[PDB]
Design a protein around this ligand. Structure first.
Ligand SMILES: Nc1ncnc2c1ncn2[C@@H]1O[C@H](COP(=O)(O)OP(=O)(O)OC[C@H]2O[C@@H](O)[C@H](O)[C@@H]2O)[C@@H](O)[C@H]1O
Ligand SMILES: Nc1ncnc2c1ncn2[C@@H]1O[C@H](COP(=O)(O)OP(=O)(O)OC[C@H]2O[C@@H](O)[C@H](O)[C@@H]2O)[C@@H](O)[C@H]1O
Ligand SMILES: [Mg+2]
Ligand SMILES: [Mg+2]
Ligand SMILES: [Mg+2]
Lengths: 384, 304, 48, 45, 21
């Protein structure tokens, strides 16, 4: 467990550059001592965490909300380049799994179907899965899926990046206090921490803690998460696919930022709440079929009011406006209904989201090659 | 089934209101518009707060102390700004300023009444808690022209989308530079020009960012058939007691959809982004543009 | 399952599955398995 | 019933008096008779 | 589709000229 003294950060235009000291690189990351602070102070909370019953250790970096996501992307590239060598397996797909944290109470049959489909998709395409950093709900479910991935795939393991708001972690202070590099810090979910109550998931391979100086106030990473995924997508010329299962108000905001940053989304209809609202909104705005001719703005407002309980008419108006803003562009949303379809139609929906992008043609054809759908590749080649 | 639904709504298509039995206490109509407390782009200047049950001029209201505020941009007297001493100017008729005609007539049935003390017109539509011109350059009616370029919302198969038994419209919407709210393209009428030129010029400047040969001719074909759907008072937050925005709305509807399809939307001038957006009653748009969209769907028998 | 009547499915699934085993109808045994038929929650008709 | 109550209000916002007739009610006498005003609330959709 | 197009044009069917702009 010898600490690294120099790191290889890739240059902005070439393949890779010169190796230089860790502190010099880590000056690009900030922390907020309180909410009031804007310029900030140096972060110093970056290293590796050891979780019980897990053989490998997971890197963690706490950075600010105003910090550049490109720097965080270099951090991920620098850690992988250090651990697996310079010629590591580049991603041809970034698969973002978002949704319900504490309100994820889904019937088992669906849970098995979503788990099976996600396991089939991620395995086959060696995808980088970006979820939240918490040990609650669908992220935990995704973690369980990637747990099966960690006991296979020979040497290289695709990272499962967990992006979590600093200020919700029962062990956040321990990670910050100390010298700047920490190699073997142990993570204790069962420890009784007073302000916060949400622990970090042990199945995530890297961690990005977005900090704004607040305490017990989630919703501070949505923009970074969308911006990071977009930055990662541009750098490795790979499509980014967001998946919305169940959901709550921040999942709606996640989908809003994702569609605002150009990233396509796959809404699983019949999987819950912010997904039923999103699916209903798309079908109302775009679907020409007969059963969606009775869809109205009033019924959509009624559904939002019964499912997210906004309290204020203005809050309801803002949630409704955000939901309608998400399904503005018909290309960026693909709705898969759970109860009306097949096992391979989910891979067709994921593939439809992949092709729905603008210019990454080589990677989209590679995704078509992984899923064994020659027709999607042909039709696409003929159209091109 | 689509045809069965279509034939069914084309064949199935003393007035009494019994809603009092359901609610019990009806809280009237939409009441009266009150602008927000913070004036936009003014650096924290606050108006004099008034309840919505007190705005009209028929109501007495002895407790009224508005704040006099004029923006620095307007106070630097640009070509489009009237003089600071608003005397020497005839309202309610077409007035010539520097040999150029400006409209100055309001759509209010009573008309504009002129105050004796300062010669500054007084807004008939109702109080707003602020005197002076503010961000508006002209005393009295600032005539704005809005351009609603519409087409039927069509799915790829070519079939028109239908909601609530009515055909669904689609309009060009721009994102404003000042407050980042989506809105209908349009602008204030320049000196010596009419609503036709203003409507067209603002739509090319904002939603097309111009300034295309046969494509230009196509755009001309689009603007050869326009209907004035409404001439109303704007619920614009920059309105004061001595300067208010009133809009004439011009609708350019593309029945076939050929001319609308040739537009390469790209935000310019005072617009950030421009896009085709579905018309419905739940839209959150700037000022009273929802009323304008209501008027265009009312005229075209479209969904809202 | 779609209409939220999952509790009624779970209350009758054990005896119905039991009847399916008794009357030699395999297709019905698979059908039931996945809709919460817990093979270990079977109950005998008589009391021993 | 909240918004459903509002829905019912939408139903009762469009009513037409179709008839104002004399009832053939069996409780009618020579000094007291029932006469009805009929209000129709039609739901097209 | 021919019928859908035909029904669509049979149901969708101050004058100002802004071509000077
Ligand atoms: N990332 C989170 N992790 C754990 N708990 C959370 C999170 N975000 C919110 N909570 C808590 O969970 C409760 C219910 O949240 P849900 O509706 O279950 O989840 P949602 O609100 O959609 O959370 C959105 C978040 O989840 C992630 O998928 C995504 O990154 C988004 O930031 C809320 O009261 C909130 O306090
Ligand atoms: N009479 C005037 N008052 C104010 N500004 C004016 C005037 N005439 C010209 N301007 C200039 O025009 C700029 C505004 O840009 P325009 O595109 O001309 O106007 P815009 O604000 O986009 O249109 C006004 C909008 O308000 C709504 O009530 C109305 O529907 C219209 O869409 C202002 O910054 C100012 O410099
Ligand atoms: Mg404008
Ligand atoms: Mg102008
Ligand atoms: Mg302009």
């Amino acid at each position: 467990s010898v600490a690294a003294k120099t790191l290889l950060i890739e240059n902005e235009d070439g393949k890779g550059s010169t190796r230089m000291e860790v502190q010099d690189f880590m000056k690009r990351f900030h922390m907020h001592a309180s909410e009031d602070d804007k310029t900030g102070s140096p972060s110093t909370a970056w290293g590796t965490l050891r979780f019980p019953t897990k053989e490998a250790t997971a890197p963690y970096l706490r950075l600010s909300v105003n910090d550049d996501p490109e720097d965080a992307l270099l951090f991920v590239k620098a850690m992988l380049a250090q651990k697996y060598g310079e010629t590591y397996d580049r991603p041809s797909l970034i698969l973002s799994v978002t949704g319900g944290a504490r309100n994820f109470t889904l019937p088992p049959r669906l849970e098995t179907a979503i788990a099976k489909g996600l396991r089939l998709a991620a395995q086959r395409t060696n995808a980088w899965v970006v979820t939240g950093g918490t040990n609650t709900g669908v992220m935990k479910l995704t973690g369980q899926i990637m747990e099966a991935l960690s006991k296979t795939q020979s040497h290289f393991i695709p990272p499962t990046i967990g992006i979590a708001t600093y200020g919700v972690i029962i062990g956040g202070d321990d990670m910050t206090r100390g010298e700047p590099p920490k190699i073997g810090l142990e993570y204790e979910m069962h420890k009784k921490d007073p302000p916060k109550t949400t622990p970090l998931d042990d199945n995530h391979n890297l961690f990005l803690l977005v900090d704004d100086g607040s305490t017990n106030k989630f919703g501070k990473e949505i923009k970074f998460r969308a911006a990071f995924e977009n930055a990662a997508g541009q750098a490795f010329a790979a499509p980014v696919v967001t998946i919305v299962v169940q959901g709550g108000p921040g999942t709606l905001g996640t989908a809003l930022q994702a569609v605002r940053q150009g990233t396509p989304i796959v809404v699983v209809d019949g999987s819950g709440l912010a997904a039923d609202v999103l699916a209903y909104a798309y079908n109302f705005m775009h679907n020409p079929l007969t059963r969606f001719k009775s869809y109205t703005i009033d019924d959509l407002r009624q559904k939002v009011a019964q499912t997210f309980n906004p309290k204020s008419s203005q809050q309801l108006t803002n949630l409704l406006d955000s939901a309608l803003e998400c399904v503005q562009d018909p290309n960026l949303v693909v709705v898969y209904s759970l109860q009306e379809s097949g096992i391979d139609e989910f891979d067709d929906c994921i593939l439809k989201a992949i092709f729905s992008s603008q210019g990454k043609l080589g990677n989209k054809l590679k995704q078509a090659m992984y899923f064994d759908q020659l027709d999607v590749a042909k039709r696409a080649l003929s159209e091109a | 089934i689509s045809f069965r639904f279509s034939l069914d709504q084309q064949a199935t298509k003393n007035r009494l209101n019994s809603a009092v039995a359901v609610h019990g206490h009806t809280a009237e109509a939409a009441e009266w518009y009150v602008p927000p407390e913070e004036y936009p782009k003014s650096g924290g200047v606050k108006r004099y707060l008034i309840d919505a049950s007190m705005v009209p001029l028929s109501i007495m209201c002895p407790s009224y102390d508005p704040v006099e505020y004029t923006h620095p941009s307007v106070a630097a007297q640009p070509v489009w700004a009237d003089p600071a001493d608003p005397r020497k100017i005839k309202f309610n008729v077409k007035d010539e300023v520097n040999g150029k005609v400006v409209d100055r007539t309001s759509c209010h049935p009573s008309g504009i009444s002129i105050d004796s003390n300062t010669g500054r017109p007084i807004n008939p539509w109702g109080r707003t808690g602020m005197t002076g011109r503010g961000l508006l350059g002209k005393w009295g009616v600032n005539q704005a022209a809005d351009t609603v370029v519409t087409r039927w919302k069509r799915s790829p198969d070519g079939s028109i989308l239908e909601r609530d038994g009515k055909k669904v419209l689609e309009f060009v919407a721009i994102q404003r530079q000042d407050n980042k709210m989506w809105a209908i393209p349009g602008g204030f009428v320049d000196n010596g020009e009419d609503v036709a030129l203003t409507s067209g010029r603002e739509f090319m400047e904002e939603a097309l960012g111009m300034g295309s040969a046969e494509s230009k001719d196509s755009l001309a074909a689009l603007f050869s058939s326009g209907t004035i759907v409404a001439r109303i008072y704007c619920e614009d937050p920059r309105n004061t007691d001595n300067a208010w925005v009133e809009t004439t709305c011009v609708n350019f509807h593309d029945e076939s959809g050929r001319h609308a399809a040739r537009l390469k939307l790209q935000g310019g001038d005072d617009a950030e982004h421009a896009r085709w957006m579905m018309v419905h009653g739940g839209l959150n748009l700037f000022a009273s543009h929802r009323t304008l969209l209501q008027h265009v769907t009312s005229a075209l028998n479209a969904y809202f | 399952s779609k209409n939220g009547q999952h509790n009624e499915i779970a209350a009758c699934i054990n005896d119905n599955l039991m009847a399916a085993m008794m009357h030699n109808k395999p297709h019905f045994v698979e059908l039931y398995l996945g809709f919460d038929a817990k093979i270990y929650e079977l109950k005998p008709s008589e009391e021993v």
